[PDB]
Amino acid sequence: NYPEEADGTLDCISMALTCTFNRWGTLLAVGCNDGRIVIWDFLTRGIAKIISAHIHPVCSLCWSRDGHKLVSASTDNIVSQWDVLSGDCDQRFRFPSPILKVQYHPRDQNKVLVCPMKSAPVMLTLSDSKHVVLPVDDDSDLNVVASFDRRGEYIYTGNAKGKILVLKTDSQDLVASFRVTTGTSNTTAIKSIEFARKGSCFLINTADRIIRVYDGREILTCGRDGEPEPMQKLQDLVNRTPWKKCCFSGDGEYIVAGSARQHALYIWEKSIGNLVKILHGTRGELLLDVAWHPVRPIIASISSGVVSIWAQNQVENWSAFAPDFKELDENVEYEERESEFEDEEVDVTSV
Amino acid sequence: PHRYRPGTVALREIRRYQKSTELLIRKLPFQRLVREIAQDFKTDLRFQSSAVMALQEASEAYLVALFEDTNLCAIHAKRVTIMPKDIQLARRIRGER
Amino acid sequence: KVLRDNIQGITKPAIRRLARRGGVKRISGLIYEETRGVLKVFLENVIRDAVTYTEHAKRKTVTAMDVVYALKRQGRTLYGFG
DNA sequence: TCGAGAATCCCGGTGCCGAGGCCGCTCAATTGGTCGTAGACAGCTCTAGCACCGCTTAAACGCACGTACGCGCTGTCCCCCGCGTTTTAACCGCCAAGGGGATTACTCCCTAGTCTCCAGGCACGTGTCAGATATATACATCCGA
DNA sequence: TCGGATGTATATATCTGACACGTGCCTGGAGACTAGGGAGTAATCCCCTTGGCGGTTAAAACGCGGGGGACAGCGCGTACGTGCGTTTAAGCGGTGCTAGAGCTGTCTACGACCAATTGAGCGGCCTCGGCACCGGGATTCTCGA
């Protein structure tokens, strides 16, 4: 459940940059400094497939709605739809050469949203080379992180000034917009926008090293220009601990976040959100990437090619090996007795 | 590679801070603290700036007197370093608590 | 517009400079949250009394004279504000 | 881990002086009335407190690092405690004696209160030099060999 | 002990905006007059403070032995200063604006004040029982084995 101890690693491929699990969590693609298409198996802990693609560090990767098509983003604006059968290029044209995010629509692998570094997020079709630019109010930030929701309804576009702007995936409907300040001095640079797997409880990373949990249902309840309070504020207590990456569990129940300083990582929940365990590590290691598995407590931790994995909370006991053995906790004195001395044709292939 | 021995810079700090007379706390965080703990007894209050200055003066003088008596206690216990039990002893003997 | 913090806004080196004006050579590490607690416990009483004067006077702003009278009741009298 | 034994802790009989209660009575608190005014309240103005914004840099913050001291340990030594024996004055009951402090009656002169008058203090409008601030520069001191 | 490396007073030049100084003018202080009531002052008495005399004993004073606290030297490894380089939010300007403090005008309900009774609280006098006090026996913590 919550993974605890060392568990080793699979450091078979160096220079690792990013990592992504498929729709079922069961595959893995790692673009590296050269940006190859490297695939693994998980129960074997073995390599499935290696395909060389380019020379550049391929930053953004995403699977498909069936878990069978892919997408890439190197330094040279190479934004094609890719495949898991052959993996071949389809589209390539000009973008600004730092590229942050591409993102399929979660109900259509035609609609894709390209987010450059210092440009507006641009929504592309994958039927052809069409592109739709979403509106920006500020045009002074030029840093408006955007994302589809889990379903496919809206796009949540938030600037570097803490201002929320919600757009509809085809008609840019501002059904909700707000701004957040806490311990009120000023607003905060929005670090990231997140989404869970079960429902709409989500969170926002902010540059005050404080993580605030939200829910789109009450956001739509207030609609535009309400005051949505956070469900839960998450932060570090003793120190600053600036953050590089945060993630949910495989349903959005645990929330484990990766620091950018120490290689010693912190685990929370959603409902309680308690710091249940500090997963430590070597101090002389730079954490670079974190990934989580849905039905297994996998922590894919890229630290400069070193991809180390901590996966536990399964502690073996008896009464499964020997069910006669009844493991008492303390001394159980008792007497078990108050006096110490049909032809159902059951289907065997019922699928 | 020139480094002083420990304590000398502390002594010249003591000299020049006992020489000078000014405020020692930035005014905006103290002001926000005052408004914060003022919020609870009544909402929507306003402040002349002179009142905030007066609060800053009185609190700073009180803390300085507390540190002087604490330092006397720590010297009596044959140490150089100050401990929170010495602070507790000073507030015990003074009769505030 | 709701404030909820800046008790931590009192920095660490400010308390160091107050100790230096106090005549202190060597400080432990455990002193700081003790000192913040002592400071807040001090301020609460004066704020209660100044609010009580203002509420009796039927106004909304807080003047300096109210602070002066609230200090005057404590035995700690301040000169220089009227 | 044990018995001897020296303070303690209920239990019971005696008696006694101080709460408690009762009574008898003067003074003050209540009723009923008027009347002059502090303040209750409405209305107008205008000024500081708040809000926002842009630019800067002083100031906070993290991090090694190297060192010095707060605490523990161990030996010492002597002086403050527990006890016995002897003096002495605190105490208690008692006696006498006399100064001073409540006490009332009786003038009286000293301050509240009124009215008239008129100038010392106060808001306002000036100028201008004491000190802030910048700049070079002897020199006093501290750590290391 | 000397030698360099410093932070530190020390001399000088320039602006400037608080401080010192004239100005009109008024509202509050001075000058006379009047009462009536607070307070000064002369008896006075009786009580409560001072002073003294024997008894007795319980407590203070004085030795004595000793063993447990004060205390001083050593040893460590721990926590906290010093210096440097890297972020950020205090601070300093400019603008708006507006609730709210502050001054003015009007009246009226509400406390000051003056006889008048009456009952309610205050001084005086019993008394009888809760507690003082003493004997006596059960209990129990301490300290050498």
PDB file of N, CA, C and O in Angstrom, chain B residues 10 13-14 17-18 20 22 24-25 32-33 36-37 39 41-42 45-48 50-51 55 59-60 62 68 71 80-82 84 87 96, chain C residues 2-7 9-10 17-18 20-28 31 38 42-43 46 48 55 60-64 67 71 76:
ATOM      1  N   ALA B  10      31.059  39.509  17.967  1.00  0.00           N
ATOM      2  CA  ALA B  10      29.935  39.639  18.886  1.00  0.00           C
ATOM      3  C   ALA B  10      30.141  40.788  19.862  1.00  0.00           C
ATOM      4  O   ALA B  10      29.202  41.540  20.148  1.00  0.00           O
ATOM      5  N   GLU B  13      29.685  44.046  18.026  1.00  0.00           N
ATOM      6  CA  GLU B  13      28.246  44.200  17.845  1.00  0.00           C
ATOM      7  C   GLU B  13      27.581  44.738  19.096  1.00  0.00           C
ATOM      8  O   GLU B  13      26.747  45.642  19.013  1.00  0.00           O
ATOM      9  N   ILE B  14      27.928  44.181  20.259  1.00  0.00           N
ATOM     10  CA  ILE B  14      27.351  44.637  21.522  1.00  0.00           C
ATOM     11  C   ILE B  14      27.664  46.103  21.754  1.00  0.00           C
ATOM     12  O   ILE B  14      26.781  46.888  22.129  1.00  0.00           O
ATOM     13  N   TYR B  17      25.605  48.290  19.096  1.00  0.00           N
ATOM     14  CA  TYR B  17      24.165  48.294  19.307  1.00  0.00           C
ATOM     15  C   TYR B  17      23.777  48.933  20.625  1.00  0.00           C
ATOM     16  O   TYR B  17      22.701  49.534  20.711  1.00  0.00           O
ATOM     17  N   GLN B  18      24.617  48.845  21.658  1.00  0.00           N
ATOM     18  CA  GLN B  18      24.324  49.659  22.827  1.00  0.00           C
ATOM     19  C   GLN B  18      24.605  51.127  22.575  1.00  0.00           C
ATOM     20  O   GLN B  18      24.048  51.978  23.273  1.00  0.00           O
ATOM     21  N   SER B  20      23.931  52.743  19.546  1.00  0.00           N
ATOM     22  CA  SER B  20      22.891  53.343  18.725  1.00  0.00           C
ATOM     23  C   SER B  20      21.520  53.230  19.387  1.00  0.00           C
ATOM     24  O   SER B  20      21.297  52.412  20.281  1.00  0.00           O
ATOM     25  N   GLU B  22      17.633  53.062  17.787  1.00  0.00           N
ATOM     26  CA  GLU B  22      16.655  53.047  16.706  1.00  0.00           C
ATOM     27  C   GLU B  22      15.777  51.818  16.888  1.00  0.00           C
ATOM     28  O   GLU B  22      15.911  51.082  17.870  1.00  0.00           O
ATOM     29  N   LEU B  24      14.541  48.010  15.617  1.00  0.00           N
ATOM     30  CA  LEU B  24      15.290  46.841  15.191  1.00  0.00           C
ATOM     31  C   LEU B  24      14.446  45.811  14.462  1.00  0.00           C
ATOM     32  O   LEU B  24      14.978  44.771  14.065  1.00  0.00           O
ATOM     33  N   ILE B  25      13.156  46.058  14.284  1.00  0.00           N
ATOM     34  CA  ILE B  25      12.250  45.129  13.625  1.00  0.00           C
ATOM     35  C   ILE B  25      11.631  45.842  12.431  1.00  0.00           C
ATOM     36  O   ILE B  25      11.256  47.014  12.534  1.00  0.00           O
ATOM     37  N   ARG B  32       1.512  43.635  10.302  1.00  0.00           N
ATOM     38  CA  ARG B  32       0.625  42.545   9.933  1.00  0.00           C
ATOM     39  C   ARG B  32       0.354  41.622  11.108  1.00  0.00           C
ATOM     40  O   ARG B  32      -0.760  41.109  11.238  1.00  0.00           O
ATOM     41  N   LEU B  33       1.336  41.443  11.994  1.00  0.00           N
ATOM     42  CA  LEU B  33       1.111  40.672  13.213  1.00  0.00           C
ATOM     43  C   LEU B  33       0.087  41.339  14.122  1.00  0.00           C
ATOM     44  O   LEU B  33      -0.783  40.663  14.698  1.00  0.00           O
ATOM     45  N   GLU B  36      -3.293  40.918  12.632  1.00  0.00           N
ATOM     46  CA  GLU B  36      -3.673  39.520  12.772  1.00  0.00           C
ATOM     47  C   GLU B  36      -4.296  39.243  14.127  1.00  0.00           C
ATOM     48  O   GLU B  36      -5.420  38.743  14.219  1.00  0.00           O
ATOM     49  N   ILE B  37      -3.578  39.563  15.203  1.00  0.00           N
ATOM     50  CA  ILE B  37      -4.150  39.240  16.508  1.00  0.00           C
ATOM     51  C   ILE B  37      -5.170  40.264  16.962  1.00  0.00           C
ATOM     52  O   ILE B  37      -5.856  40.035  17.963  1.00  0.00           O
ATOM     53  N   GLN B  39      -7.581  40.983  14.837  1.00  0.00           N
ATOM     54  CA  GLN B  39      -8.754  40.549  14.082  1.00  0.00           C
ATOM     55  C   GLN B  39      -9.754  39.776  14.936  1.00  0.00           C
ATOM     56  O   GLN B  39     -10.961  39.831  14.679  1.00  0.00           O
ATOM     57  N   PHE B  41     -10.676  39.815  18.317  1.00  0.00           N
ATOM     58  CA  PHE B  41     -11.541  40.417  19.317  1.00  0.00           C
ATOM     59  C   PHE B  41     -12.634  41.263  18.694  1.00  0.00           C
ATOM     60  O   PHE B  41     -13.687  41.446  19.310  1.00  0.00           O
ATOM     61  N   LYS B  42     -12.409  41.751  17.479  1.00  0.00           N
ATOM     62  CA  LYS B  42     -13.358  42.575  16.751  1.00  0.00           C
ATOM     63  C   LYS B  42     -12.883  42.637  15.311  1.00  0.00           C
ATOM     64  O   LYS B  42     -11.682  42.723  15.057  1.00  0.00           O
ATOM     65  N   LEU B  45     -11.232  46.873  12.015  1.00  0.00           N
ATOM     66  CA  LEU B  45     -10.665  47.981  12.760  1.00  0.00           C
ATOM     67  C   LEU B  45      -9.664  48.737  11.905  1.00  0.00           C
ATOM     68  O   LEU B  45      -9.136  48.223  10.918  1.00  0.00           O
ATOM     69  N   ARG B  46      -9.411  49.971  12.302  1.00  0.00           N
ATOM     70  CA  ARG B  46      -8.448  50.819  11.635  1.00  0.00           C
ATOM     71  C   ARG B  46      -7.438  51.308  12.656  1.00  0.00           C
ATOM     72  O   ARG B  46      -7.688  51.296  13.862  1.00  0.00           O
ATOM     73  N   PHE B  47      -6.287  51.742  12.165  1.00  0.00           N
ATOM     74  CA  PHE B  47      -5.187  52.076  13.052  1.00  0.00           C
ATOM     75  C   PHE B  47      -4.511  53.352  12.601  1.00  0.00           C
ATOM     76  O   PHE B  47      -4.115  53.470  11.440  1.00  0.00           O
ATOM     77  N   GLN B  48      -4.380  54.298  13.516  1.00  0.00           N
ATOM     78  CA  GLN B  48      -3.394  55.346  13.337  1.00  0.00           C
ATOM     79  C   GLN B  48      -2.012  54.727  13.456  1.00  0.00           C
ATOM     80  O   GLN B  48      -1.803  53.808  14.251  1.00  0.00           O
ATOM     81  N   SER B  50       0.737  55.902  14.598  1.00  0.00           N
ATOM     82  CA  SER B  50       1.384  56.199  15.867  1.00  0.00           C
ATOM     83  C   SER B  50       1.114  55.130  16.913  1.00  0.00           C
ATOM     84  O   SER B  50       1.991  54.835  17.732  1.00  0.00           O
ATOM     85  N   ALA B  51      -0.079  54.530  16.887  1.00  0.00           N
ATOM     86  CA  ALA B  51      -0.392  53.464  17.830  1.00  0.00           C
ATOM     87  C   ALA B  51       0.473  52.236  17.580  1.00  0.00           C
ATOM     88  O   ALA B  51       0.953  51.601  18.529  1.00  0.00           O
ATOM     89  N   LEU B  55       3.206  50.559  20.192  1.00  0.00           N
ATOM     90  CA  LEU B  55       3.265  49.140  20.524  1.00  0.00           C
ATOM     91  C   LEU B  55       4.648  48.571  20.272  1.00  0.00           C
ATOM     92  O   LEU B  55       5.163  47.786  21.085  1.00  0.00           O
ATOM     93  N   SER B  59       6.988  46.959  23.319  1.00  0.00           N
ATOM     94  CA  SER B  59       7.367  45.554  23.240  1.00  0.00           C
ATOM     95  C   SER B  59       8.876  45.384  23.183  1.00  0.00           C
ATOM     96  O   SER B  59       9.430  44.480  23.829  1.00  0.00           O
ATOM     97  N   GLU B  60       9.557  46.270  22.453  1.00  0.00           N
ATOM     98  CA  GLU B  60      11.002  46.155  22.344  1.00  0.00           C
ATOM     99  C   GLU B  60      11.689  46.446  23.672  1.00  0.00           C
ATOM    100  O   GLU B  60      12.628  45.731  24.059  1.00  0.00           O
ATOM    101  N   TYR B  62      10.370  45.990  26.652  1.00  0.00           N
ATOM    102  CA  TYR B  62      10.076  44.862  27.526  1.00  0.00           C
ATOM    103  C   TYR B  62      10.995  43.683  27.255  1.00  0.00           C
ATOM    104  O   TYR B  62      11.524  43.065  28.194  1.00  0.00           O
ATOM    105  N   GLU B  68      18.152  41.173  29.817  1.00  0.00           N
ATOM    106  CA  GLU B  68      19.135  41.551  30.833  1.00  0.00           C
ATOM    107  C   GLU B  68      19.021  40.673  32.073  1.00  0.00           C
ATOM    108  O   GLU B  68      20.030  40.161  32.589  1.00  0.00           O
ATOM    109  N   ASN B  71      20.278  37.170  31.362  1.00  0.00           N
ATOM    110  CA  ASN B  71      21.730  37.079  31.312  1.00  0.00           C
ATOM    111  C   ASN B  71      22.326  37.053  32.708  1.00  0.00           C
ATOM    112  O   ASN B  71      23.312  36.346  32.949  1.00  0.00           O
ATOM    113  N   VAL B  80      27.844  30.568  29.993  1.00  0.00           N
ATOM    114  CA  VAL B  80      27.917  31.736  29.127  1.00  0.00           C
ATOM    115  C   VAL B  80      26.659  31.724  28.274  1.00  0.00           C
ATOM    116  O   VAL B  80      26.124  32.773  27.898  1.00  0.00           O
ATOM    117  N   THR B  81      26.142  30.533  28.023  1.00  0.00           N
ATOM    118  CA  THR B  81      25.045  30.342  27.096  1.00  0.00           C
ATOM    119  C   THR B  81      23.719  30.420  27.846  1.00  0.00           C
ATOM    120  O   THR B  81      23.629  30.053  29.017  1.00  0.00           O
ATOM    121  N   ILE B  82      22.691  30.908  27.158  1.00  0.00           N
ATOM    122  CA  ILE B  82      21.372  31.147  27.732  1.00  0.00           C
ATOM    123  C   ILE B  82      20.431  30.003  27.373  1.00  0.00           C
ATOM    124  O   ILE B  82      20.412  29.535  26.231  1.00  0.00           O
ATOM    125  N   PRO B  84      16.300  28.182  27.897  1.00  0.00           N
ATOM    126  CA  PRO B  84      14.898  28.530  28.165  1.00  0.00           C
ATOM    127  C   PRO B  84      14.465  28.283  29.594  1.00  0.00           C
ATOM    128  O   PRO B  84      13.520  28.937  30.055  1.00  0.00           O
ATOM    129  N   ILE B  87      15.003  31.546  31.220  1.00  0.00           N
ATOM    130  CA  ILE B  87      13.895  32.460  30.935  1.00  0.00           C
ATOM    131  C   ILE B  87      12.695  32.150  31.819  1.00  0.00           C
ATOM    132  O   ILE B  87      12.054  33.059  32.373  1.00  0.00           O
ATOM    133  N   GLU B  96       5.312  37.585  37.301  1.00  0.00           N
ATOM    134  CA  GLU B  96       4.348  37.626  36.216  1.00  0.00           C
ATOM    135  C   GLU B  96       3.564  36.332  36.085  1.00  0.00           C
ATOM    136  O   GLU B  96       2.538  36.316  35.400  1.00  0.00           O
TER     137      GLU B  96
ATOM    138  N   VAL C   2      -8.228  37.986   4.491  1.00  0.00           N
ATOM    139  CA  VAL C   2      -8.106  37.427   5.831  1.00  0.00           C
ATOM    140  C   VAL C   2      -6.651  37.050   6.058  1.00  0.00           C
ATOM    141  O   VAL C   2      -6.086  36.247   5.306  1.00  0.00           O
ATOM    142  N   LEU C   3      -6.049  37.632   7.087  1.00  0.00           N
ATOM    143  CA  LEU C   3      -4.684  37.313   7.466  1.00  0.00           C
ATOM    144  C   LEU C   3      -4.696  36.188   8.485  1.00  0.00           C
ATOM    145  O   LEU C   3      -5.587  36.115   9.334  1.00  0.00           O
ATOM    146  N   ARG C   4      -3.706  35.305   8.396  1.00  0.00           N
ATOM    147  CA  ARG C   4      -3.677  34.162   9.296  1.00  0.00           C
ATOM    148  C   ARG C   4      -2.279  33.820   9.797  1.00  0.00           C
ATOM    149  O   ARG C   4      -2.135  32.838  10.534  1.00  0.00           O
ATOM    150  N   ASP C   5      -1.263  34.598   9.449  1.00  0.00           N
ATOM    151  CA  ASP C   5       0.127  34.264   9.749  1.00  0.00           C
ATOM    152  C   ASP C   5       0.903  35.558   9.952  1.00  0.00           C
ATOM    153  O   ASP C   5       0.303  36.617  10.159  1.00  0.00           O
ATOM    154  N   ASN C   6       2.233  35.455   9.837  1.00  0.00           N
ATOM    155  CA  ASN C   6       3.331  36.403  10.097  1.00  0.00           C
ATOM    156  C   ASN C   6       3.718  36.476  11.565  1.00  0.00           C
ATOM    157  O   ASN C   6       4.470  37.381  11.929  1.00  0.00           O
ATOM    158  N   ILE C   7       3.240  35.568  12.418  1.00  0.00           N
ATOM    159  CA  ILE C   7       3.917  35.381  13.697  1.00  0.00           C
ATOM    160  C   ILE C   7       5.334  34.875  13.469  1.00  0.00           C
ATOM    161  O   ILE C   7       6.266  35.273  14.175  1.00  0.00           O
ATOM    162  N   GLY C   9       6.886  35.894  10.967  1.00  0.00           N
ATOM    163  CA  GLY C   9       7.494  37.039  10.312  1.00  0.00           C
ATOM    164  C   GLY C   9       8.538  37.761  11.139  1.00  0.00           C
ATOM    165  O   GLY C   9       9.373  38.476  10.579  1.00  0.00           O
ATOM    166  N   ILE C  10       8.504  37.604  12.459  1.00  0.00           N
ATOM    167  CA  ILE C  10       9.638  37.991  13.290  1.00  0.00           C
ATOM    168  C   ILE C  10      10.788  37.055  12.951  1.00  0.00           C
ATOM    169  O   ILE C  10      10.719  35.852  13.212  1.00  0.00           O
ATOM    170  N   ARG C  17      19.664  40.590  17.333  1.00  0.00           N
ATOM    171  CA  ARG C  17      20.055  41.974  17.564  1.00  0.00           C
ATOM    172  C   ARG C  17      19.448  42.532  18.842  1.00  0.00           C
ATOM    173  O   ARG C  17      20.083  43.356  19.515  1.00  0.00           O
ATOM    174  N   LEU C  18      18.244  42.084  19.206  1.00  0.00           N
ATOM    175  CA  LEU C  18      17.690  42.459  20.505  1.00  0.00           C
ATOM    176  C   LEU C  18      18.513  41.890  21.645  1.00  0.00           C
ATOM    177  O   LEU C  18      18.712  42.553  22.669  1.00  0.00           O
ATOM    178  N   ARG C  20      21.718  41.348  21.411  1.00  0.00           N
ATOM    179  CA  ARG C  20      22.978  42.083  21.427  1.00  0.00           C
ATOM    180  C   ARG C  20      22.826  43.429  22.114  1.00  0.00           C
ATOM    181  O   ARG C  20      23.720  43.851  22.852  1.00  0.00           O
ATOM    182  N   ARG C  21      21.705  44.118  21.885  1.00  0.00           N
ATOM    183  CA  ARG C  21      21.442  45.325  22.659  1.00  0.00           C
ATOM    184  C   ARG C  21      21.234  44.995  24.129  1.00  0.00           C
ATOM    185  O   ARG C  21      21.597  45.788  25.002  1.00  0.00           O
ATOM    186  N   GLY C  22      20.706  43.809  24.424  1.00  0.00           N
ATOM    187  CA  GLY C  22      20.561  43.399  25.806  1.00  0.00           C
ATOM    188  C   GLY C  22      21.863  43.058  26.496  1.00  0.00           C
ATOM    189  O   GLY C  22      21.901  43.013  27.727  1.00  0.00           O
ATOM    190  N   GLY C  23      22.928  42.817  25.738  1.00  0.00           N
ATOM    191  CA  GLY C  23      24.199  42.479  26.348  1.00  0.00           C
ATOM    192  C   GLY C  23      24.414  40.991  26.512  1.00  0.00           C
ATOM    193  O   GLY C  23      24.695  40.514  27.612  1.00  0.00           O
ATOM    194  N   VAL C  24      24.285  40.249  25.418  1.00  0.00           N
ATOM    195  CA  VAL C  24      24.312  38.794  25.424  1.00  0.00           C
ATOM    196  C   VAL C  24      25.452  38.327  24.535  1.00  0.00           C
ATOM    197  O   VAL C  24      25.575  38.776  23.390  1.00  0.00           O
ATOM    198  N   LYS C  25      26.270  37.414  25.051  1.00  0.00           N
ATOM    199  CA  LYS C  25      27.404  36.906  24.296  1.00  0.00           C
ATOM    200  C   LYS C  25      27.064  35.689  23.448  1.00  0.00           C
ATOM    201  O   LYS C  25      27.475  35.614  22.287  1.00  0.00           O
ATOM    202  N   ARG C  26      26.314  34.734  23.987  1.00  0.00           N
ATOM    203  CA  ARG C  26      26.229  33.420  23.366  1.00  0.00           C
ATOM    204  C   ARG C  26      24.838  32.845  23.553  1.00  0.00           C
ATOM    205  O   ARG C  26      24.373  32.699  24.684  1.00  0.00           O
ATOM    206  N   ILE C  27      24.191  32.498  22.451  1.00  0.00           N
ATOM    207  CA  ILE C  27      22.779  32.151  22.436  1.00  0.00           C
ATOM    208  C   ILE C  27      22.645  30.681  22.077  1.00  0.00           C
ATOM    209  O   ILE C  27      23.386  30.175  21.229  1.00  0.00           O
ATOM    210  N   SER C  28      21.702  29.994  22.711  1.00  0.00           N
ATOM    211  CA  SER C  28      21.360  28.639  22.308  1.00  0.00           C
ATOM    212  C   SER C  28      20.469  28.670  21.072  1.00  0.00           C
ATOM    213  O   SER C  28      20.266  29.707  20.438  1.00  0.00           O
ATOM    214  N   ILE C  31      15.850  29.084  21.887  1.00  0.00           N
ATOM    215  CA  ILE C  31      15.338  30.271  22.551  1.00  0.00           C
ATOM    216  C   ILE C  31      14.190  30.884  21.765  1.00  0.00           C
ATOM    217  O   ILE C  31      13.318  31.547  22.342  1.00  0.00           O
ATOM    218  N   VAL C  38       6.459  34.248  24.388  1.00  0.00           N
ATOM    219  CA  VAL C  38       6.454  35.309  25.396  1.00  0.00           C
ATOM    220  C   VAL C  38       5.960  36.622  24.802  1.00  0.00           C
ATOM    221  O   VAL C  38       5.147  37.333  25.411  1.00  0.00           O
ATOM    222  N   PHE C  42       2.490  38.617  25.720  1.00  0.00           N
ATOM    223  CA  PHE C  42       2.538  40.015  26.127  1.00  0.00           C
ATOM    224  C   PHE C  42       1.546  40.870  25.351  1.00  0.00           C
ATOM    225  O   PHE C  42       0.819  41.671  25.944  1.00  0.00           O
ATOM    226  N   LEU C  43       1.505  40.715  24.028  1.00  0.00           N
ATOM    227  CA  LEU C  43       0.715  41.639  23.211  1.00  0.00           C
ATOM    228  C   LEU C  43      -0.785  41.474  23.392  1.00  0.00           C
ATOM    229  O   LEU C  43      -1.529  42.455  23.210  1.00  0.00           O
ATOM    230  N   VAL C  46      -2.633  43.921  26.062  1.00  0.00           N
ATOM    231  CA  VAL C  46      -2.692  45.318  25.664  1.00  0.00           C
ATOM    232  C   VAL C  46      -3.689  45.505  24.537  1.00  0.00           C
ATOM    233  O   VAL C  46      -4.442  46.491  24.512  1.00  0.00           O
ATOM    234  N   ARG C  48      -6.378  43.635  24.002  1.00  0.00           N
ATOM    235  CA  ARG C  48      -7.698  43.540  24.628  1.00  0.00           C
ATOM    236  C   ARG C  48      -8.119  44.846  25.266  1.00  0.00           C
ATOM    237  O   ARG C  48      -9.258  45.299  25.087  1.00  0.00           O
ATOM    238  N   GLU C  55     -14.135  50.395  21.935  1.00  0.00           N
ATOM    239  CA  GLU C  55     -15.525  49.967  21.884  1.00  0.00           C
ATOM    240  C   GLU C  55     -16.391  50.778  22.827  1.00  0.00           C
ATOM    241  O   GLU C  55     -17.550  51.064  22.513  1.00  0.00           O
ATOM    242  N   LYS C  60     -14.410  53.416  15.509  1.00  0.00           N
ATOM    243  CA  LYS C  60     -13.931  52.278  14.746  1.00  0.00           C
ATOM    244  C   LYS C  60     -12.426  52.249  14.575  1.00  0.00           C
ATOM    245  O   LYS C  60     -11.875  51.175  14.320  1.00  0.00           O
ATOM    246  N   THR C  61     -11.752  53.381  14.704  1.00  0.00           N
ATOM    247  CA  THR C  61     -10.308  53.457  14.588  1.00  0.00           C
ATOM    248  C   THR C  61      -9.686  53.410  15.974  1.00  0.00           C
ATOM    249  O   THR C  61     -10.336  53.686  16.980  1.00  0.00           O
ATOM    250  N   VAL C  62      -8.407  53.068  16.019  1.00  0.00           N
ATOM    251  CA  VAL C  62      -7.667  52.964  17.266  1.00  0.00           C
ATOM    252  C   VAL C  62      -6.646  54.087  17.298  1.00  0.00           C
ATOM    253  O   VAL C  62      -5.792  54.181  16.411  1.00  0.00           O
ATOM    254  N   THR C  63      -6.728  54.937  18.311  1.00  0.00           N
ATOM    255  CA  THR C  63      -5.807  56.055  18.421  1.00  0.00           C
ATOM    256  C   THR C  63      -4.605  55.648  19.259  1.00  0.00           C
ATOM    257  O   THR C  63      -4.477  54.503  19.692  1.00  0.00           O
ATOM    258  N   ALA C  64      -3.713  56.595  19.514  1.00  0.00           N
ATOM    259  CA  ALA C  64      -2.556  56.307  20.342  1.00  0.00           C
ATOM    260  C   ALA C  64      -2.859  56.438  21.821  1.00  0.00           C
ATOM    261  O   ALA C  64      -2.252  55.728  22.633  1.00  0.00           O
ATOM    262  N   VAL C  67      -3.842  53.215  23.493  1.00  0.00           N
ATOM    263  CA  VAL C  67      -2.671  52.394  23.762  1.00  0.00           C
ATOM    264  C   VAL C  67      -1.953  52.892  25.001  1.00  0.00           C
ATOM    265  O   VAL C  67      -1.502  52.101  25.839  1.00  0.00           O
ATOM    266  N   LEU C  71      -1.399  50.781  28.460  1.00  0.00           N
ATOM    267  CA  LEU C  71      -0.093  50.568  29.068  1.00  0.00           C
ATOM    268  C   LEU C  71      -0.060  51.105  30.486  1.00  0.00           C
ATOM    269  O   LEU C  71       0.572  50.507  31.363  1.00  0.00           O
ATOM    270  N   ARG C  76       3.385  49.884  33.288  1.00  0.00           N
ATOM    271  CA  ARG C  76       4.447  50.282  32.377  1.00  0.00           C
ATOM    272  C   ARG C  76       3.992  51.544  31.664  1.00  0.00           C
ATOM    273  O   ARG C  76       3.198  51.487  30.727  1.00  0.00           O
TER     274      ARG C  76
END
